[PDB]
Design an enzyme around this catalytic site. Structure first.
Site, PDB file in Angstrom:
ATOM      1  N   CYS A  26      -4.532  -6.966  60.331  1.00 44.70           N
ATOM      2  CA  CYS A  26      -6.206  -6.938  60.828  1.00 44.70           C
ATOM      3  C   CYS A  26      -6.022  -8.081  61.348  1.00 44.70           C
ATOM      4  CB  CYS A  26      -7.138  -7.614  59.491  1.00 44.70           C
ATOM      5  SG  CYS A  26      -8.832  -7.515  60.150  1.00 44.70           S
ATOM      6  N   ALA A  29     -16.442  -2.064  61.626  1.00 41.92           N
ATOM      7  CA  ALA A  29     -15.735  -3.410  61.217  1.00 41.92           C
ATOM      8  C   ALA A  29     -16.852  -4.664  61.006  1.00 41.92           C
ATOM      9  CB  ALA A  29     -14.525  -3.729  61.557  1.00 41.92           C
ATOM     10  N   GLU A  73     -19.746  -3.965  58.543  1.00 42.93           N
ATOM     11  CA  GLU A  73     -19.595  -3.897  56.974  1.00 42.93           C
ATOM     12  C   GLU A  73     -18.398  -4.741  56.385  1.00 42.93           C
ATOM     13  OE1 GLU A  73     -21.449  -2.590  55.200  1.00 42.93           O
ATOM     14  OE2 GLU A  73     -22.198  -0.729  56.241  1.00 42.93           O
ATOM     15  N   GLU A  92     -16.977 -16.259  60.504  1.00 49.46           N
ATOM     16  CA  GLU A  92     -18.204 -15.985  59.814  1.00 49.46           C
ATOM     17  C   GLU A  92     -18.147 -16.205  58.274  1.00 49.46           C
ATOM     18  OE1 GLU A  92     -19.361 -11.966  62.462  1.00 49.46           O
ATOM     19  OE2 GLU A  92     -17.997 -11.824  60.521  1.00 49.46           O
ATOM     20  N   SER A 116     -17.318  -8.162  56.982  1.00 47.11           N
ATOM     21  CA  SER A 116     -17.875  -9.487  56.754  1.00 47.11           C
ATOM     22  C   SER A 116     -18.840  -9.685  55.604  1.00 47.11           C
ATOM     23  CB  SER A 116     -18.199 -10.284  57.958  1.00 47.11           C
ATOM     24  OG  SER A 116     -16.972 -10.612  58.609  1.00 47.11           O
TER      25      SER A 116
HETATM   26  C1  HEM Z   1     -13.469  -9.485  55.213  1.00 49.06           C
HETATM   27  C2  HEM Z   1     -12.962  -9.067  56.536  1.00 49.06           C
HETATM   28  C3  HEM Z   1     -11.767  -8.134  56.945  1.00 49.06           C
HETATM   29  C4  HEM Z   1     -10.934  -7.664  56.020  1.00 49.06           C
HETATM   30  C5  HEM Z   1     -10.794  -7.854  54.399  1.00 49.06           C
HETATM   31  C6  HEM Z   1      -9.879  -6.783  56.567  1.00 49.06           C
HETATM   32  C7  HEM Z   1      -8.952  -6.135  56.182  1.00 49.06           C
HETATM   33  C8  HEM Z   1      -8.096  -5.120  56.996  1.00 49.06           C
HETATM   34  C9  HEM Z   1      -6.985  -4.432  56.767  1.00 49.06           C
HETATM   35  C10 HEM Z   1      -6.363  -4.427  55.119  1.00 49.06           C
HETATM   36  C11 HEM Z   1      -6.530  -3.697  57.578  1.00 49.06           C
HETATM   37  C12 HEM Z   1      -4.966  -2.963  57.817  1.00 49.06           C
HETATM   38  C13 HEM Z   1      -5.160  -1.638  57.293  1.00 49.06           C
HETATM   39  C14 HEM Z   1      -3.949  -0.785  57.283  1.00 49.06           C
HETATM   40  O1  HEM Z   1      -2.991  -1.244  57.127  1.00 49.06           O
HETATM   41  O2  HEM Z   1      -4.193   0.419  57.428  1.00 49.06           O
HETATM   42  C15 HEM Z   1      -7.401  -3.963  58.900  1.00 49.06           C
HETATM   43  C16 HEM Z   1      -7.046  -3.454  60.074  1.00 49.06           C
HETATM   44  C17 HEM Z   1      -7.965  -3.510  61.137  1.00 49.06           C
HETATM   45  N1  HEM Z   1      -8.956  -4.529  61.157  1.00 49.06           N
HETATM   46 FE1  HEM Z   1      -9.888  -5.748  59.690  1.00 49.06          FE
HETATM   47  N2  HEM Z   1     -10.577  -6.650  58.236  1.00 49.06           N
HETATM   48  C18 HEM Z   1     -11.728  -7.373  58.106  1.00 49.06           C
HETATM   49  C19 HEM Z   1     -12.449  -7.657  59.207  1.00 49.06           C
HETATM   50  C20 HEM Z   1     -12.181  -7.146  60.591  1.00 49.06           C
HETATM   51  C21 HEM Z   1     -13.216  -7.617  61.578  1.00 49.06           C
HETATM   52  C22 HEM Z   1     -13.951  -8.545  61.819  1.00 49.06           C
HETATM   53  C23 HEM Z   1     -12.610  -6.553  62.693  1.00 49.06           C
HETATM   54  C24 HEM Z   1     -13.151  -6.136  64.018  1.00 49.06           C
HETATM   55  C25 HEM Z   1     -14.323  -6.863  64.518  1.00 49.06           C
HETATM   56  C26 HEM Z   1     -11.554  -5.797  62.065  1.00 49.06           C
HETATM   57  C27 HEM Z   1     -10.621  -5.108  62.987  1.00 49.06           C
HETATM   58  C28 HEM Z   1      -9.629  -4.333  62.546  1.00 49.06           C
HETATM   59  C29 HEM Z   1      -8.830  -3.555  63.453  1.00 49.06           C
HETATM   60  C30 HEM Z   1      -8.901  -3.274  64.735  1.00 49.06           C
HETATM   61  C31 HEM Z   1      -7.548  -3.138  62.376  1.00 49.06           C
HETATM   62  C32 HEM Z   1      -6.582  -2.298  63.024  1.00 49.06           C
HETATM   63  C33 HEM Z   1      -5.265  -2.914  63.495  1.00 49.06           C
HETATM   64  C34 HEM Z   1      -4.143  -2.158  63.780  1.00 49.06           C
HETATM   65  O3  HEM Z   1      -4.078  -1.160  63.239  1.00 49.06           O
HETATM   66  O4  HEM Z   1      -3.539  -2.680  64.516  1.00 49.06           O
HETATM   67  N3  HEM Z   1     -11.368  -6.107  60.809  1.00 49.06           N
HETATM   68  N4  HEM Z   1      -8.426  -4.989  58.414  1.00 49.06           N
HETATM   69  C1  LIG Z   2      -4.126   8.466  57.284  1.00 51.00           C
HETATM   70  C2  LIG Z   2      -5.564   8.049  56.735  1.00 51.00           C
HETATM   71  O1  LIG Z   2      -6.228   8.556  56.038  1.00 51.00           O
HETATM   72  N1  LIG Z   2      -5.987   6.764  57.309  1.00 51.00           N
HETATM   73  C3  LIG Z   2      -7.633   6.398  56.555  1.00 51.00           C
HETATM   74  C4  LIG Z   2      -7.764   4.609  56.905  1.00 51.00           C
HETATM   75  N2  LIG Z   2      -7.073   4.109  58.067  1.00 51.00           N
HETATM   76  C5  LIG Z   2      -7.677   3.394  58.986  1.00 51.00           C
HETATM   77  C6  LIG Z   2      -8.814   3.720  60.070  1.00 51.00           C
HETATM   78  C7  LIG Z   2      -9.484   2.688  60.813  1.00 51.00           C
HETATM   79  C8  LIG Z   2      -9.093   1.526  60.761  1.00 51.00           C
HETATM   80  O2  LIG Z   2      -9.723   0.180  61.883  1.00 51.00           O
HETATM   81  C9  LIG Z   2     -10.670  -0.687  61.000  1.00 51.00           C
HETATM   82  C10 LIG Z   2     -12.021  -0.361  61.419  1.00 51.00           C
HETATM   83  C11 LIG Z   2     -11.412   0.818  60.933  1.00 51.00           C
HETATM   84  O3  LIG Z   2     -11.218   0.928  59.283  1.00 51.00           O
HETATM   85  C12 LIG Z   2     -12.489   0.468  58.912  1.00 51.00           C
HETATM   86  C13 LIG Z   2     -12.126  -0.514  57.788  1.00 51.00           C
HETATM   87  N3  LIG Z   2     -11.700  -1.959  57.991  1.00 51.00           N
HETATM   88  C14 LIG Z   2     -12.659  -2.815  58.165  1.00 51.00           C
HETATM   89  C15 LIG Z   2     -12.018  -4.009  58.709  1.00 51.00           C
HETATM   90  N4  LIG Z   2     -10.518  -3.725  58.597  1.00 51.00           N
HETATM   91  C16 LIG Z   2     -10.375  -2.551  58.252  1.00 51.00           C
HETATM   92  C17 LIG Z   2     -13.119   1.790  57.967  1.00 51.00           C
HETATM   93  C18 LIG Z   2     -12.479   2.811  58.542  1.00 51.00           C
HETATM   94  C19 LIG Z   2     -12.617   4.025  58.340  1.00 51.00           C
HETATM   95  C20 LIG Z   2     -13.952   4.230  57.646  1.00 51.00           C
HETATM   96 CL1  LIG Z   2     -14.040   5.953  57.339  1.00 51.00          CL
HETATM   97  C21 LIG Z   2     -14.517   3.204  57.233  1.00 51.00           C
HETATM   98  C22 LIG Z   2     -14.161   1.888  57.690  1.00 51.00           C
HETATM   99 CL2  LIG Z   2     -15.442   0.461  57.280  1.00 51.00          CL
HETATM  100  O4  LIG Z   2     -12.919  -0.762  59.749  1.00 51.00           O
HETATM  101  C23 LIG Z   2      -7.816   0.917  60.237  1.00 51.00           C
HETATM  102  C24 LIG Z   2      -7.024   1.973  59.486  1.00 51.00           C
HETATM  103  C25 LIG Z   2      -5.736   4.552  58.246  1.00 51.00           C
HETATM  104  C26 LIG Z   2      -5.178   5.448  57.428  1.00 51.00           C
END
Ligand code: HEM
Ligand SMILES: CC(=O)N1CCN(c2ccc(OC[C@H]3CO[C@](Cn4ccnc4)(c4ccc(Cl)cc4Cl)O3)cc2)CC1
Length: 403
Positions: A350, A240, A243, A359, A245
Site C-alpha cells: 500500500c 480506499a 473506508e 490522517e 482511515s
Molecule cells: C489504514 C489505512 C490503510 C491500510 C491498513 C491499507 C492496507 C493495504 C494493504 C494491506 C494493501 C495490499 C493488498 C494486497 O497485497 O493485495 C493495500 C494496497 C493498496 N492500497 Fe491501501 N491501505 C490503507 C490506506 C490506503 C489509502 C489512503 C489509499 C489510497 C487513497 C490506499 C490505496 C491502495 C492501493 C492503490 C493499493 C494497491 C497497491 C498495488 O497493488 O500496487 N490505501 N493497502
Molecule cells: C484475487 C482477488 O480476489 N483479489 C480481492 C482483493 N484485491 C484487491 C482489490 C483492490 C485493491 O485496491 C485497494 C482499494 C482496493 O482494495 C480496497 C481495500 N484497501 C484499502 C486500502 N488498501 C486496500 C477494497 C477492495 C475491494 C473491495 Cl470489494 C473493498 C475495498 Cl475497501 O481499497 C487491492 C487489492 C486483490 C485480490
C-alpha cells in the site's frame, strides 16, 4: 478433519484467539468461506512468503482452462462491474501492474500528500468544533468518518452533493454476506455509475486535482492510462479514502481509550505518536485478509497448495505471530513494529501509506489534545466490531467528551 468456516462467530468474536489456535496447529490450513474451499495463512513467515511469491496472482480477471474463479471481495458482482473494480494496480500482475503503478505514482506523490497537511488539520479542527465540549457523541459518525471522506473528495475533486450516498454503498460492500449478495451487487453498480459520471465530468472540466492529473499523465514507453484503467483506478482510490482511515482512527481511538498507560505516553511525549499509529495498525490490522490465486501449485511452509486454489493471507493474524512479535496480544506504543503486514508487502505494498499516516497522526493528536478527559461511553466489552474480513472496523463508538 474439521474445516473452519470463516463465517462462524469464531472469526468475529475475540477472533485473534481463534487465529492463534489455528496458527499453533498449522500456519497454512484449508478453510470454508462463502461456500468455497480455500487456504488460510496465519503464520508470519508463511504470510510474508506467500505475498512475495508471484506464482500467487492478484488478478481476478485472468481465465484458466476449465476453472471458475469466484473471489470473496466480488461476491454478488455482475461480470461487468467486477471488471471496473478489477482493472487497477491491486488487481493486476506484472508487467501490467508495473506500468499502472508507475503512471499513478507520477501524480500520487508524497509532495501532493504533504501539501494537503494544512487542509487536513483545518478540517480536523472544524469537525471538533462541531462536536461540543460536553456530553456523549458517536465519535465515528461525527469525526472518524467525515474527516477522511472530506480529504479524499478534495483530492479527487468530488463534490459534497454526491457524498453521503457514496458512503452508503461503500459500507454495504465491506460486508460479504451471501444473504445480501444482491444488495451488494446493486451497491457496486451504483458506485461504478457514480465513477463513470465523475470521470466524464472531470475530462470536460479539468482542474488541479488528482483525477485531472491522472487523466493527462503519460509516459514515453508506458504510454497513458486507458479509459477503463482510469475509471477503475479512480474507483479504487475513492473507495480506499472512504473506508480505510475511518477504521484506523476509530480503532485507534478505542485502543488508546482502553489503555490509559499507553495514552499517557502519547500525551506526555508527542514524538511517540508516529509509532503509536504503527502499533495500532500492527495490533488490529484493518485489512484482516488479502486474497491471492495459485496460478501454479505452490509450497508454503511445507504445505503444498494445489494449482487453482484460492489463498487468503491473514495479514492480521500474522501481525500477532509470537515468533515475529513478542507478547503479540500486548498493545505497546513503544515496541518495535518494523515488519508488520498491515500495509502489505512486496510489489503491491500500500500506495496510500503516506496519506493514511498523515490522517491518523493529525486526527488522534487533535482529538486527545483537545479532550483531556475523553473516555469511552460504553463498556469496553460492549463495543461492536464490524463483521468483515475485508476491512475490520467500528461503526459506532460512543465517547464522553467531558469525562
Ligand atoms: C489504514 C489505512 C490503510 C491500510 C491498513 C491499507 C492496507 C493495504 C494493504 C494491506 C494493501 C495490499 C493488498 C494486497 O497485497 O493485495 C493495500 C494496497 C493498496 N492500497 Fe491501501 N491501505 C490503507 C490506506 C490506503 C489509502 C489512503 C489509499 C489510497 C487513497 C490506499 C490505496 C491502495 C492501493 C492503490 C493499493 C494497491 C497497491 C498495488 O497493488 O500496487 N490505501 N493497502
Ligand atoms: C484475487 C482477488 O480476489 N483479489 C480481492 C482483493 N484485491 C484487491 C482489490 C483492490 C485493491 O485496491 C485497494 C482499494 C482496493 O482494495 C480496497 C481495500 N484497501 C484499502 C486500502 N488498501 C486496500 C477494497 C477492495 C475491494 C473491495 Cl470489494 C473493498 C475495498 Cl475497501 O481499497 C487491492 C487489492 C486483490 C485480490
Amino acid at each position: 478433519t474439521t474445516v473452519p468456516d470463516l463465517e462462524s462467530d469464531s472469526f468475529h468474536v475475540d477472533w485473534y484467539r481463534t487465529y492463534a489456535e489455528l496458527r499453533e496447529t498449522a500456519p497454512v490450513t484449508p478453510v470454508r468461506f462463502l461456500g468455497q474451499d480455500a487456504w488460510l495463512v496465519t503464520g508470519y513467515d508463511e504470510a510474508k512468503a506467500a505475498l512475495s511469491d508471484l506464482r500467487l496472482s492478484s488478478d481476478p480477471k485472468k481465465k484458466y482452462p476449465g476453472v471458475e474463479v469466484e473471489f470473496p471481495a466480488y461476491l454478488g458482482f455482475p461480470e461487468d462491474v467486477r471488471n471496473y473494480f478489477a482493472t487497477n494496480m491491486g488487481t493486476s500482475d506484472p508487467p501490467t501492474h508495473t506500468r499502472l503503478r508507475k503512471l499513478v505514482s507520477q501524480e500520487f506523490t508524497v509532495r501532493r500528500v504533504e501539501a494537503m497537511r494544512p487542509r487536513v488539520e483545518q478540517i480536523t479542527a472544524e469537525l471538533l468544533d462541531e462536536v461540543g465540549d460536553s456530553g456523549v457523541v458517536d465519535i465515528v459518525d461525527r469525526f472518524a468518518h467525515p474527516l477522511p471522506i472530506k480529504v479524499i473528495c478534495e483530492l479527487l475533486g468530488v463534490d459534497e452533493k454526491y457524498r453521503g450516498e457514496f458512503g452508503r454503498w461503500s459500507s454495504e460492500i465491506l460486508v460479504m454476506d451471501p444473504e445480501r449478495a444482491e444488495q451488494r451487487g446493486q451497491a457496486a453498480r451504483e458506485v461504478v455509475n457514480f465513477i463513470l459520471d465523475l470521470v466524464e465530468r472531470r475530462r470536460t472540466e479539468p482542474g488541479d486535482d488528482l483525477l485531472s492529473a491522472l487523466i493527462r499523465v503519460q509516459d514515453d514507453d508506458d504510454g497513458r492510462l486507458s479509459a477503463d484503467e482510469l475509471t477503475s483506478i479512480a474507483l479504487v482510490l475513492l473507495l480506499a479514502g472512504f473506508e480505510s482511515s475511518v477504521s484506523l482512527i476509530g480503532i485507534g481511538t478505542y485502543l488508546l481509550l482502553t489503555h490509559p498507560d499507553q495514552l499517557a505516553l502519547v500525551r506526555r511525549d508527542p514524538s511517540a505518536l508516529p509509532n503509536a499509529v504503527e502499533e495500532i495498525l500492527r495490533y488490529i490490522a484493518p485489512p484482516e485478509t488479502t486474497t491471492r490465486f495459485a496460478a501454479e501449485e505452490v509450497e508454503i511452509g511445507g504445505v503444498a497448495i494445489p494449482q487453482y486454489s484460492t489463498v487468503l493471507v491473514a495479514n492480521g493474524a500474522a501481525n500477532r505471530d509470537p515468533k515475529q512479535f513478542p507478547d503479540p496480544h500486548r498493545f505497546d506504543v513503544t515496541r518495535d513494529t518494523r515488519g508488520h503486514l498491515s500495509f502489505g508487502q512486496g510489489i503491491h505494498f500500500c500506495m496510500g501509506r503516506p496519506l493514511a499516516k498523515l490522517e491518523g497522526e493529525v486526527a488522534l493528536r487533535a482529538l486527545f489534545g483537545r479532550f483531556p478527559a475523553l473516555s469511552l461511553g460504553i463498556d469496553a466489552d460492549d463495543v461492536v466490531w464490524r463483521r468483515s474480513l475485508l476491512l475490520r472496523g467500528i461503526d459506532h463508538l460512543p465517547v464522553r467528551l467531558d469525562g
